[PDB]
Amino acid sequence: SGLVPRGSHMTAQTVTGAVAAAQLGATLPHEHVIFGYPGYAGDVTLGPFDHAAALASCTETARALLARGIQTVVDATPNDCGRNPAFLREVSEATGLQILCATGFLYEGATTYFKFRASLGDAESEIYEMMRTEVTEGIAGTGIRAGVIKLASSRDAITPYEQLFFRAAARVQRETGVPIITHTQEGQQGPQQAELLTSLGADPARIMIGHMDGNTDPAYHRETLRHGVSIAFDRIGLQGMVGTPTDAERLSVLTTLLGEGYADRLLLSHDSIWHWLGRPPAIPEAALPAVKDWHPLHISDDILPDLRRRGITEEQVGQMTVGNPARLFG
Amino acid sequence: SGLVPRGSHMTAQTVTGAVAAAQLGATLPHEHVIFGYPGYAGDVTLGPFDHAAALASCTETARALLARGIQTVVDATPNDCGRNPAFLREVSEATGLQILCATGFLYEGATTYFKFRASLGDAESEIYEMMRTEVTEGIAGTGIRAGVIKLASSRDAITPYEQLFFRAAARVQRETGVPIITHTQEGQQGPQQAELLTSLGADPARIMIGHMDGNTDPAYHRETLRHGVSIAFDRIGLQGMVGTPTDAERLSVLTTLLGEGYADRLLLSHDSIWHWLGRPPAIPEAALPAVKDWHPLHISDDILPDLRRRGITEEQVGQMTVGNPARLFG
Ligand SMILES: [Co+2]
Ligand SMILES: [Co+2]
Ligand SMILES: [Co+2]
Ligand SMILES: [Co+2]
């Protein structure tokens, strides 16, 4: 036990169907099989999607993950960032790797559709309708259901526009028990997000505040944790990428939190992109070190062994990688 | 003659092929057959595209236009707003109505893809590559070529990000002679846009600065016109829609400019949307008068007769509706 999920639950849904909490295994709570920044579709002429090569590439990464003992990936790709459940299902059915997809949108400057629905009507209820339908019935008539709601906020505040999504999410959460994972911008708003969602009636045991590794002051992480929610160092491997701290700094914070007993509330991920949508990313020369360990095998090969040699126990490692994911999503 | 297009020309391209300047006929220089605010795709579950109903609805509007003697529509829909040349081609082949589609993106807060390419590399050259390919070879391997480049800027300035597109556009323009139509936000930046593009080497005779009806001070229109470019009152029918002036005000300005002899530089359009992408628009109760005349038959039925009874001549009307479009796009 400890802090178990409240009332209203629905068996964890993956792109290939419902899976039991115990079948989840080691999990990466925040990754992107395919991803495109909003607008990517507008570059379809020179940046078309090569299905054959994306499939070949993604299943390969999937296989490398299974070999590491990772049995599940939570794909956090927002509805406006290329989210494609049917494709994810292909990858999963081809490899056996389990994948949960999300429902939600990126922050304010991403797109403009709902900012517009909001000027003309009740956008909260429209977002609520969409989230609930995708979480209980499916996405785009495919029958594939989202297994997490994804929320995002800006750096300086959770804007009134962003809050429409947080309330729609809170509602669906209370009604269905579906988990909620978030994006925080540049290490800010973690506590505000936690305060808001719990105040809205969302179960702190089904809430994971993301990109918390974006902040290096542990007092900041401790304040979020006070709310009873889990937090994720989900961008491990992306170092100094205009903003992000280094892994050295992330681990310093993690080991402090771990030695303070917060293991039941810490999750680990990379926030990697296996295949980019649109025109392949032009990576400058100086950016190389920053993205060097920014691939999904980094935690399994570098992070988990580094934590262990630091005194973190095998049980603490299993709690973060298997224990937490099973309660959060299962 | 007068101010005819410079060197480097390419026969006007429509979704169904090249058309001769003389085949253009009366034209609406800025309209949207289908349109979706960026992000619309993310609402695919409850706001899917009903092809059968969009086709039935759009050809109908097309037929009403042909009956008015309008033989061509310049669809100004940006690459990030649902632009779909294949669909436009269906509408055109089904009715005979001629349609030219565009190449380009909406302003800064619309999407984020190129803001990202810009942090990692040479976005100007990537936008240039895309624009040129779509204007000379085609869009998405369909062989359908864009017949206009579409540019947009914000209200307070033509941002450094927005200027990447203006330079890519200027380049393609000099190289291919393809026309350029713009969007101006809330009646500002008209002169700045005209100054910038001509300074970049773009032909003022193949440049139409849009949404100029958004400003009601004719001194503002006169300054843009000084640059030798044409300007369009292309949102006729959208009144008071949070910002926009009333048609009464637009016509007051138009008749002043007309009686000052600027007929060779004035174009008329509605900026209507025949079929919305995403969830159908929820139109409040107070918004009704604002969108009442916001449909493509408004100029033919209300505007052109109102101008005539005001003293505007049949020749001045033909110059705006046929003369200008033929030089600009043909
Ligand atoms: Co994120
Ligand atoms: Co992410
Ligand atoms: Co516009
Ligand atoms: Co428009």
Side-chain angles (χ1 to χ4, degrees):
Chain A
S1 75
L3 178 53
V4 303
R6 78 145 80 84
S8 265
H9 178 276
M10 199 168 42
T11 154
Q13 201 73 39
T14 66
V15 296
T16 65
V19 166
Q23 300 316 302
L24 290 174
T27 305
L28 284 175
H30 190 123
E31 304 295 328
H32 302 278
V33 174
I34 56 174
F35 178 100
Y37 276 98
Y40 76 86
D43 193 33
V44 53
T45 291
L46 300 175
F49 185 64
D50 187 333
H51 178 299
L55 185 61
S57 181
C58 291
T59 58
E60 180 208 81
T61 281
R63 281 192 305 276
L65 283 172
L66 286 167
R68 297 303 187 301
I70 298 305
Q71 309 181 203
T72 306
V73 171
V74 174
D75 184 289
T77 310
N79 303 18
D80 54 346
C81 303
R83 180 187 62 160
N84 187 334
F87 179 67
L88 267 40
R89 169 199 274 161
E90 304 182 53
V91 175
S92 186
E93 297 181 319
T95 67
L97 172 69
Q98 288 168 157
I99 305 165
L100 286 72
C101 66
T103 182
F105 276 62
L106 208 59
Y107 36 121
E108 278 217 33
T111 47
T112 221
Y113 180 76
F114 275 111
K115 286 165 109 172
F116 183 72
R117 309 291 301 176
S119 65
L120 306 177
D122 194 1
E124 191 185 309
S125 302
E126 300 192 306
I127 292 168
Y128 162 75
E129 281 161 34
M130 162 189 96
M131 294 191 172
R132 183 187 54 54
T133 303
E134 306 191 315
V135 175
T136 77
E137 288 147 61
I139 304 163
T142 68
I144 298 172
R145 294 157 58 175
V148 289
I149 298 178
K150 164 72 126 120
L151 296 184
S153 57
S154 306
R155 178 235 290 155
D156 300 318
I158 308 184
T159 71
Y161 175 54
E162 276 155 21
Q163 295 183 50
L164 296 165
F165 295 83
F166 275 67
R167 303 201 288 278
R171 283 207 264 182
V172 183
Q173 206 294 304
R174 283 139 43 193
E175 289 169 27
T176 63
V178 75
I180 289 174
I181 72 179
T182 82
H183 153 105
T184 54
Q185 190 63 30
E186 296 164 59
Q188 291 193 50
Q189 303 318 305
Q192 289 74 0
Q193 278 185 12
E195 165 54 38
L196 184 50
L197 289 163
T198 51
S199 80
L200 291 167
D203 192 350
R206 290 289 263 200
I207 291 175
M208 180 183 78
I209 300 296
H211 309 336
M212 287 295 295
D213 44 330
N215 191 303
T216 66
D217 182 338
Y220 169 89
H221 309 70
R222 283 178 205 118
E223 183 195 337
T224 311
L225 291 168
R226 263 177 152 288
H227 294 287
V229 302
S230 313
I231 56 169
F233 283 64
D234 56 32
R235 302 194 67 172
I236 305 175
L238 188 61
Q239 322 181 64
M241 180 56 105
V242 56
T244 58
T246 76
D247 282 0
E249 297 166 319
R250 297 191 172 69
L251 293 180
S252 172
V253 182
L254 259 179
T255 52
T256 282
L257 296 176
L258 280 162
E260 284 175 356
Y262 292 110
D264 298 309
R265 308 304 159 75
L266 301 163
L267 285 91
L268 311 178
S269 234
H270 315 89
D271 185 26
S272 63
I273 292 171
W274 307 356
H275 191 88
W276 287 83
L277 290 187
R279 195 166 322 203
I283 308 175
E285 191 48 47
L288 286 303
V291 309
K292 197 207 66 178
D293 295 316
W294 191 45
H295 66 81
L297 312 183
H298 179 33
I299 279 162
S300 283
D301 299 353
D302 312 311
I303 311 302
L304 301 190
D306 196 357
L307 284 171
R308 290 303 313 267
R309 63 176 183 184
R310 297 202 190 195
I312 303 306
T313 82
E314 179 177 310
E315 198 160 59
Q316 278 179 305
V317 157
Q319 190 53 58
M320 294 190 275
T321 60
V322 180
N324 296 356
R327 181 147 294 164
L328 217 191
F329 308 96
Chain B
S1 75
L3 178 53
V4 303
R6 78 145 80 84
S8 265
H9 178 276
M10 199 168 42
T11 154
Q13 201 73 39
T14 66
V15 296
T16 65
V19 166
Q23 300 316 302
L24 290 174
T27 305
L28 284 175
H30 190 123
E31 304 295 328
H32 302 278
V33 174
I34 56 174
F35 178 100
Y37 276 98
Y40 76 86
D43 193 33
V44 53
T45 291
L46 300 175
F49 185 64
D50 187 333
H51 178 299
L55 185 61
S57 181
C58 291
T59 58
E60 180 208 81
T61 281
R63 281 192 305 276
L65 283 172
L66 286 167
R68 297 303 187 301
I70 298 305
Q71 309 181 203
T72 306
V73 171
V74 174
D75 184 289
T77 310
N79 303 18
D80 54 346
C81 303
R83 180 187 62 160
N84 187 334
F87 179 67
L88 267 40
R89 169 199 274 161
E90 304 182 53
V91 175
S92 186
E93 297 181 319
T95 67
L97 172 69
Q98 288 168 157
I99 305 165
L100 286 72
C101 66
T103 182
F105 276 62
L106 208 59
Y107 36 121
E108 278 217 33
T111 47
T112 221
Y113 180 76
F114 275 111
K115 286 165 109 172
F116 183 72
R117 309 291 301 176
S119 65
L120 306 177
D122 194 1
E124 191 185 309
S125 302
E126 300 192 306
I127 292 168
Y128 162 75
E129 281 161 34
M130 162 189 96
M131 294 191 172
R132 183 187 54 54
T133 303
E134 305 191 315
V135 175
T136 77
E137 288 147 61
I139 304 163
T142 68
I144 298 172
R145 294 157 58 175
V148 289
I149 298 178
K150 164 72 126 120
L151 296 184
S153 57
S154 306
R155 178 235 290 155
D156 300 318
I158 308 184
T159 71
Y161 175 54
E162 276 155 21
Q163 295 183 50
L164 296 165
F165 295 83
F166 275 67
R167 303 201 288 278
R171 283 207 264 182
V172 183
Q173 206 294 304
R174 283 139 43 193
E175 289 169 27
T176 63
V178 75
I180 289 174
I181 72 179
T182 82
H183 153 105
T184 54
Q185 190 63 30
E186 296 164 59
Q188 291 193 50
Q189 303 318 305
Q192 289 74 0
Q193 278 185 12
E195 165 54 38
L196 184 50
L197 289 163
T198 51
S199 80
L200 291 167
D203 192 350
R206 290 289 263 200
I207 291 175
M208 180 183 78
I209 300 296
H211 309 336
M212 287 295 295
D213 44 330
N215 191 303
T216 66
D217 182 338
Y220 169 89
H221 309 70
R222 283 178 205 118
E223 183 195 337
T224 311
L225 291 168
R226 263 177 152 288
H227 294 287
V229 302
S230 313
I231 56 169
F233 283 64
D234 56 32
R235 302 194 67 172
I236 305 175
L238 188 61
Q239 322 181 64
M241 180 56 105
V242 56
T244 58
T246 76
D247 282 0
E249 297 166 319
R250 297 191 172 69
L251 293 180
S252 172
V253 182
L254 259 179
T255 52
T256 282
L257 296 176
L258 280 162
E260 284 175 356
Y262 292 110
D264 298 309
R265 308 304 159 75
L266 301 163
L267 285 91
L268 311 178
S269 234
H270 315 89
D271 185 26
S272 63
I273 292 171
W274 307 356
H275 191 88
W276 287 83
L277 290 187
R279 195 166 322 203
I283 308 175
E285 191 48 47
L288 286 303
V291 309
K292 197 207 66 178
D293 295 316
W294 191 45
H295 66 81
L297 312 183
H298 179 33
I299 279 162
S300 283
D301 299 353
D302 312 311
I303 311 302
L304 301 190
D306 196 357
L307 284 171
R308 290 303 313 267
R309 63 176 183 184
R310 297 202 190 194
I312 303 306
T313 82
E314 179 177 310
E315 198 160 59
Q316 278 179 305
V317 157
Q319 190 53 58
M320 294 190 275
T321 60
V322 180
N324 296 356
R327 181 147 294 164
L328 217 191
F329 308 96

